[PDB]
Design an enzyme around this catalytic site. Structure first.
Site, PDB file in Angstrom:
ATOM      1  N   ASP A 109      33.143  42.750 -35.066  1.00 50.16           N
ATOM      2  CA  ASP A 109      32.978  41.315 -34.846  1.00 50.16           C
ATOM      3  C   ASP A 109      31.603  40.779 -35.230  1.00 50.16           C
ATOM      4  OD1 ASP A 109      32.141  41.506 -31.315  1.00 50.16           O
ATOM      5  OD2 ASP A 109      32.353  43.103 -32.773  1.00 50.16           O
ATOM      6  N   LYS A 161      23.014  42.369 -16.926  1.00 54.35           N
ATOM      7  CA  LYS A 161      23.109  41.069 -16.279  1.00 54.35           C
ATOM      8  C   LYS A 161      21.876  40.219 -16.563  1.00 54.35           C
ATOM      9  CE  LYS A 161      25.066  38.463 -12.691  1.00 54.35           C
ATOM     10  NZ  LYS A 161      23.874  37.888 -11.996  1.00 54.35           N
ATOM     11  N   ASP A 217      27.856  37.161 -33.650  1.00 49.31           N
ATOM     12  CA  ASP A 217      29.016  37.852 -33.102  1.00 49.31           C
ATOM     13  C   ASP A 217      30.151  36.834 -33.115  1.00 49.31           C
ATOM     14  OD1 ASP A 217      31.008  38.811 -31.048  1.00 49.31           O
ATOM     15  OD2 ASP A 217      29.476  40.229 -30.453  1.00 49.31           O
TER      16      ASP A 217
HETATM   17  N1  LIG Z   1      40.180  51.624 -32.138  1.00 44.81           N
HETATM   18  C1  LIG Z   1      39.980  51.273 -30.821  1.00 44.81           C
HETATM   19  N2  LIG Z   1      39.182  50.250 -31.062  1.00 44.81           N
HETATM   20  C2  LIG Z   1      38.740  49.577 -29.998  1.00 44.81           C
HETATM   21  C3  LIG Z   1      39.318  49.836 -28.762  1.00 44.81           C
HETATM   22  N3  LIG Z   1      38.748  48.992 -27.865  1.00 44.81           N
HETATM   23  C4  LIG Z   1      37.848  48.225 -28.504  1.00 44.81           C
HETATM   24  N4  LIG Z   1      37.842  48.564 -29.824  1.00 44.81           N
HETATM   25  C5  LIG Z   1      36.950  47.943 -30.808  1.00 44.81           C
HETATM   26  O1  LIG Z   1      35.666  47.824 -30.231  1.00 44.81           O
HETATM   27  C6  LIG Z   1      34.925  46.888 -31.041  1.00 44.81           C
HETATM   28  C7  LIG Z   1      33.933  46.091 -30.193  1.00 44.81           C
HETATM   29  O2  LIG Z   1      34.528  45.708 -28.954  1.00 44.81           O
HETATM   30  P1  LIG Z   1      34.589  44.141 -28.602  1.00 44.81           P
HETATM   31  O3  LIG Z   1      33.363  43.450 -29.055  1.00 44.81           O
HETATM   32  O4  LIG Z   1      34.789  43.947 -27.017  1.00 44.81           O
HETATM   33  O5  LIG Z   1      35.863  43.532 -29.349  1.00 44.81           O
HETATM   34  P2  LIG Z   1      37.388  43.545 -28.873  1.00 44.81           P
HETATM   35  O6  LIG Z   1      37.844  45.014 -28.443  1.00 44.81           O
HETATM   36  O7  LIG Z   1      38.117  43.101 -30.075  1.00 44.81           O
HETATM   37  O8  LIG Z   1      37.534  42.513 -27.660  1.00 44.81           O
HETATM   38  P3  LIG Z   1      37.366  40.926 -27.754  1.00 44.81           P
HETATM   39  O9  LIG Z   1      36.660  40.636 -29.065  1.00 44.81           O
HETATM   40  O10 LIG Z   1      36.607  40.282 -26.476  1.00 44.81           O
HETATM   41  O11 LIG Z   1      38.782  40.325 -27.811  1.00 44.81           O
HETATM   42  C8  LIG Z   1      35.973  45.944 -31.656  1.00 44.81           C
HETATM   43  O12 LIG Z   1      35.863  45.976 -33.078  1.00 44.81           O
HETATM   44  C9  LIG Z   1      37.330  46.525 -31.201  1.00 44.81           C
HETATM   45  O13 LIG Z   1      38.229  46.555 -32.302  1.00 44.81           O
HETATM   46  C10 LIG Z   1      40.303  50.854 -28.664  1.00 44.81           C
HETATM   47  O14 LIG Z   1      40.787  51.060 -27.574  1.00 44.81           O
HETATM   48  N5  LIG Z   1      40.731  51.567 -29.721  1.00 44.81           N
END
Ligand SMILES: Nc1nc2c(ncn2[C@@H]2O[C@H](COP(=O)(O)OP(=O)(O)OP(=O)(O)O)[C@@H](O)[C@H]2O)c(=O)[nH]1
Ligand SMILES: Nc1nc2c(ncn2[C@@H]2O[C@H](COP(=O)(O)OP(=O)(O)OP(=O)(O)O)[C@@H](O)[C@H]2O)c(=O)[nH]1
Lengths: 359, 360
Positions: A109, A161, A217
C-alpha cells in the site's frame, strides 16, 4: 539479494478491493504492485517473493505475465490461513535462509520513489540486524511514532500510540532485514510490527533511515487520492513530457493512450484517466481517478472521486467528497453523490446527500 | 362596471423577488401577473379598474400609465400613506365605486387562474344578493380556510378560517363581486375584509359562492409560484399550443421569449418559462425553473425547480435544486451546489449551500 512483498483483503477502500485485490488496483494507469516490482527491477533484485493468503488466481495470471515481461523471477508464497505480516516471512523462511544476505521486505500500500541502493548503503553503514524507513507527516495523532538519534539513526523506542509527541517520524513500510531476524520470526499468525519490531527496538537492533519527501500510504480512499496528487507532482518534476498537455487541460493530468476525451470539457488538476475510458463533452473532472472502461457521460461534474471499472456515470451528475464507485456501477442522469461508497454491480437512481454506504 | 385590484404592498413570501420589484410586477411566464389580470379584465369589458397601493411604486405608476395607453381602458390609482390592509383600500376609493349602483369586482393580485368574469357576473345577477365569492378545490384542506356550500344555490352558511375539522373542501379564490352596500359597511381604518367584513356578511348569509372548474393557484410563495407556473404552462399548452416553443432539445411545455437565446446541445425540460433577453449556454439543463429577464446561465449547469432573478449570472457546472430563489444581480461562481438557498439581491456566492438557508 531478494525481497518480500507482503496477501489479503485490504479492508479500507473496500469498494475497489471487492472486485480485484488491493495490489492490483490501478494507481495512475498502473497497479501499485507493478510500481514496486519496476522499482525492484531497477534496483537489481533478481527474484522477489510475493506472499498471498487470499486465493488470487488473477494475481498469479498477471504476475506470471510480468515475470515473463520484466526478466526477474518471482516465487509464490501461498498461505491457506491468514498468517498476518510476520507469518509470511516464516513461511518463506527456507528461501531467505539459503543466502546469508540482507533482504528487503515491502508493504504494498505504500507509494513513494524508492531509495533502494541508498538504503542498502545505509544498512551496510550501520551494520546491525534490521533497518526501517521513516518519513514525516503533519498529523502525529494518527500513526505510531519512532524516536531517532541524530548521526546514527538508531531507534531507542517504538511507540504504537500517539498523543505524547515523542517523535515526528512515522514508519514508511520498507524494512531491510538480516536472516537472524528470520530466525526470530515465528510461523503462527503474528504481525511483524506488533511485537517482532518491538523486541528488536527494545534490544536496540533497529535503525532508521529517512526519505526526502513524497511518501503516501494509499490503503484508504482519501489517502489514495492524496497519493495520486503527490505522484502526479513527482511525475511533473521528473517526467514532464509523460503527462498530457492540452487547451482544455489544467495542471498535471495523466491520460492513457487508449483513453478518449471529448472536446469543450475542462479536465482539472491532479487526475489520472485509465485505459479505454470515454469522457464526453462538457465534463469537468478535478482530483479524481477514473479506472478502466469507465464511461463518464456529458455535462458531468466530478471532484475527488474514484470511478471504478466499467462504470457509467450519467449526464449532469455531480460527484464530490471522495465517493468511490465499485465495478460496473450505473449512475443515472441528474444525480448528486457526496461520500457515497457504492458497492459493485449497483444502479443508483437516488441522490446521496450525506456520506453513506450504498449496498 | 368597474373593478378594484389589491396590490398594495410588499409580499413577505417570495421576499428575494419582492425586494427589488413589487409583487404584482414580477414576471409570471414572461409577463407581470397584474398584466395578466388587467388583460383578462379588459377582455371582460370593464371600462376602468382601480389599483390601490400603499407602498410607493413609481415604476408601477409609470408601467401602468404605459399600459393605460396600451389597452385603452382607463386606470385611476388609489394612493395610501400607511397600510390600509385589504378592506381599507375599498373604503379609500369608496366614492369611485359609489358613483354608480353596479356590482364591482375586487381581485387579489397573487391569484393566477382562468378568469370566468362573464360567468361570475351571470352568477351574481342570478343569485341577486350582496356579495359573490369564487371558491376552488384543493387537495390539502389543512392549510387554507374553508367555505361550506349547499348544492344548487351555493350559499355560504359559515366562514371558517381555521382548518382541521373537515367541514368543507372548498377554499377562497381571491375573487369577489361586491355591491355598493357592502362598501357602505367598510370603514376606513386598516382592517382586512376576509377577517371580519366577509365574516359578518356570511353570518347574516348574504355571501354566495361560485365554483371554477380547474387551474387555480395563489402564487404568493415561491414553491406556489413554481407550481402555478407549471399549471399555467399546462393550461397554455391546452389552449395556445402554438405559443410554446418546440425544439429537438426541448422537452414538454416550454415558453421561450423571442429575445431569449438558447445555446447548442442543451436539454431544457418540462415547465420552463424563459424570460426576455436571457442567455442559456451549451449543455445547460433547466427543468421546472423560471428564469426572469436579462439572466445569464453559463455552460454545463443543472437547474431544477428554481427562480432565477433579473440580471443574474449562474456560472459553470452549478447544480441548483429545491427552489433556490435568486434575487436580482446575484452572480453564482462556477462549480457550486445550491439547495434551498434563498439568496438576497446583489450577492456573490462562492460557497456551496447544502441545506435550505437564507443567504444575506
Ligand atoms: N499474503 C498475506 N498477506 C497479508 C496478510 N495479511 C496482511 N497481508 C498484507 O500485509 C500488507 C500490509 O498490511 P496492511 O497495511 O494492514 O494492509 P491490508 O492487509 O491490506 O489491510 P487494510 O489495508 O487496512 O485493508 C498488505 O499488503 C497486505 O496485503 C495475510 O494474511 N496473508
Ligand atoms: N395597496 C395596499 N395593498 C395592500 C395592502 N396590504 C395588502 N395589500 C394587497 O392585498 C393583496 C392580497 O393580500 P395578500 O394575499 O396577503 O398579499 P401580500 O399583502 O402581498 O402579502 P404576502 O403575499 O403574504 O407577502 C395583495 O395583492 C397586496 O398587494 C396595503 O396596505 N395597501
Amino acid at each position: 539479494m531478494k525481497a518480500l512483498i507482503l496477501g489479503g483483503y485490504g479492508t479500507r477502500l473496500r469498494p475497489l478491493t471487492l472486485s480485484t485485490p488491493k495490489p492490483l488496483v490501478d494507481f495512475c494507469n498502473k497497479p501499485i504492485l507493478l510500481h514496486q516490482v519496476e522499482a525492484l527491477a531497477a534496483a537489481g533484485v533478481d527474484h522477489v517473493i510475493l506472499a498471498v493468503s487470499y486465493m488470487s488466481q488473477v494475481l498469479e495470471k498477471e504476475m506470471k505475465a510480468q515475470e515473463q515481461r520484466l526478466g526477474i523471477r518471482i516465487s509464490m508464497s501461498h498461505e491457506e490461513e491468514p498468517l498476518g505480516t510476520a507469518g509470511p516471512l516464516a513461511l518463506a523462511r527456507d528461501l531467505l535462509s539459503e543466502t546469508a544476505d540482507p533482504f528487503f521486505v515491502l508493504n504494498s500500500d505504500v507509494i513513494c520513489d524508492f531509495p533502494f541502493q541508498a538504503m542498502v548503503q545505509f544498512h551496510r553503514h550501520h551494520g546491525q540486524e534490521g533497518s526501517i524507513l521513516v518519513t514525516k507527516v503533519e498529523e502525529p495523532s494518527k500513526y505510531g511514532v519512532v524516536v531517532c538519534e541524530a548521526d546514527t539513526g538508531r531507534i531507542h523506542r517504538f511507540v504504537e500510540k500517539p498523543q505524547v509527541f515523542v517523535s515526528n517520524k512515522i514508519n514508511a513500510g520498507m524494512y531491510i532485514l538480516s536472516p537472524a531476524v528470520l530466525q526470530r520470526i515465528q510461523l503462527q499468525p503474528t504481525s511483524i510490527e506488533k511485537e517482532v519490531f518491538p523486541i528488536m527496538a527494545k534490544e536496540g537492533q533497529l535503525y532508521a533511515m529517512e526519505l526526502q519527501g513524497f511518501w503516501m500510504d494509499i490503503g484508504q480512499p482519501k489517502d489514495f487520492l492524496t497519493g495520486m496528487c503527490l505522484f502526479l507532482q513527482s511525475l511533473r518534476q521528473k517526467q514532464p513530457e509523460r503527462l498530457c498537455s492540452g487547451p482544455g487541460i489544467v495542471g498535471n493530468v495523466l491520460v492513457d493512450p487508449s483513453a478518449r476525451i471529448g472536446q469543450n470539457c475542462s479536465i482539472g488538476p491532479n487526475v489520472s484517466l485509465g485505459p479505454g475510458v470515454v469522457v464526453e463533452d462538457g465534463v469537468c473532472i478535478r482530483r479524481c481517478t477514473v479506472l478502466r472502461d469507465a464511461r463518464i457521460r456529458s455535462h458531468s461534474w466530478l471532484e475527488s472521486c474514484i470511478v471504478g471499472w466499467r462504470c457509467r456515470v450519467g449526464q449532469w451528475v455531480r460527484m464530490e467528497n471522495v465517493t468511490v464507485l465499485g465495478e460496473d456501477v450505473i449512475v443515472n442522469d441528474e444525480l448528486y453523490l457526496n461520500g457515497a461508497s457504492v458497492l459493485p454491480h449497483k444502479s443508483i437512481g437516488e441522490s446521496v446527500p450525506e456520506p453513506r454506504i450504498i449496498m
